C-alpha cells in the first residue's frame with residue numbers, strides 16, 4: 001500500500017504514480033538528488049515528503065515498498081538499499097547494467113523475504129496477453145517465426161541520457177530491446193538461446209551510442225525472432241507478429257506505453273481482430289505487484305524476468321559490437 005519513489009522521473013510522473021493511486025496504494029515520499037527539484041516535483045504530484053537521501057526514503061517506517069526509476073547505473077545500489085531496509089522493490093528496466101548485479105538483486109530480495117519485480121509493462125497489455133493465449137490455444141498451430149517492430153522517435157524532452165554515456169546505461173539496446181526480449185518470452189512462452197545483430201548511430205546517439213538496432217534471436221524451440229528497435233524513426237508504427245503453421249497473429253500499434261493496438265488472426269478461414277479487454281498497462285502491473293506483497297502471486301515481471309531481458313540485451317550488445325553470435329546465458 002505505501003510507496004517511496006526513488007527518482008524524480010518522467011515515468012513515475014506520467015504513469016506509475018497514478019497507477020499506484022488507481023490500484024489502492026499511496027506514494028508517501030520520494031527522493032531526488034536535488035532539494036529544489038524534489039520539492040517542486042513532490043508538490044507537482046501531490047506527494048507529502050521529499051528527501052535528498054536514499055536511506056531516509058528507504059528507512060522511512062511509513063514506506064512499505066519502493067519504486068526505482070532513476071537512470072540505469074543507480075538501479076542496483078538503490079534497490080539493494082531498499083532490500084537491506086526490508087522494503088519490497090519495483091525496479092525499472094533494465095534491471096541493472098551487468099548480469100552479476102541483476103542476480104545479486106534477485107538473491108538479496110529472496111534472502112530478505114521481500115518482493116522484487118522488474119517493470120516490464122508490455123506483458124501487461126491485453127494485446128500481448130491475447131496473443132499469448134491465442135498461441136497456447138493452438139490458433140496458429142506451431143510457431144515458426146516472430147517479428148517485433150519497436151522503431152520509434154525519442155521525443156525532444158528525452159534526448160538526454162538515453163543518447164549519451166553508454167557507461168551509464170544509454171543506447172537503444174538497453175532501453176528498448178530489453179522490452180522486446182521480455183515480450184517475446186511472455187508471448188512465445190519460451191526462452192531465447194542466442195542473438196545476432198547490427199547496430200548503428202543514425203544521427204541521434206552522441207559518440208559511441210547506438211540509436212537503432214536490428215537483430216535476430218534463436219529461441220529454444222527453434223523459432224527465429226527478428227527485432228527492430230530505434231529512437232530515430234518518426235513514421236514507423238509499432239508491431240509484434242507470430243507466424244505459425246496454421247495461423248499468423250499480427251499485432252499492430254502494440255509496443256507503446258498506452259493501452260492501444262489491435263491483434264489480427266489470419267488463418268485458412270480469413271482474418272479477424274481478436275477481442276481485447278484492455279486496461280492501463282501500469283495499473284495492471286501495480287495491481288499485480290500489490291497482490292504479490294500481500295502474499296498472493298508474483299509481480300507481472302519478476303526480478304528473474306529482468307535478469308533474462310538484461311541477459312538478452314547484453315548478448316545483443318555483444319553481437320552488434322563483435323559481429324559474432326552471442327549466447328544468452330543468465331547465470332541463474
Ligand SMILES: NC(=O)C1=CN([C@@H]2O[C@H](COP(=O)(O)OP(=O)(O)OC[C@H]3O[C@@H](n4cnc5c(N)ncnc54)[C@H](OP(=O)(O)O)[C@@H]3O)[C@@H](O)[C@H]2O)C=CC1
Nearest residue numbers: 007008009010011032033069070071072092093094119121
Ligand atoms: N517500464 C517503462 O514503461 C519505462 C521505464 N523507464 C525507465 O525508467 C528510468 C527513468 O526513465 P525516464 O523517467 O524516462 O527518465 P528521466 O530522465 O525523466 O528521469 C531519470 C532521472 O533524471 C533526473 N532529472 C529529472 N529532471 C532533471 C533535470 N531537470 N535536470 C537533471 N536531471 C533531472 C532525475 O534525477 P533525480 O531523481 O536525482 O531527481 C531522474 O532520476 C530508466 O531506467 C528507464 O529505462 C522509462 C520509461 C518507461
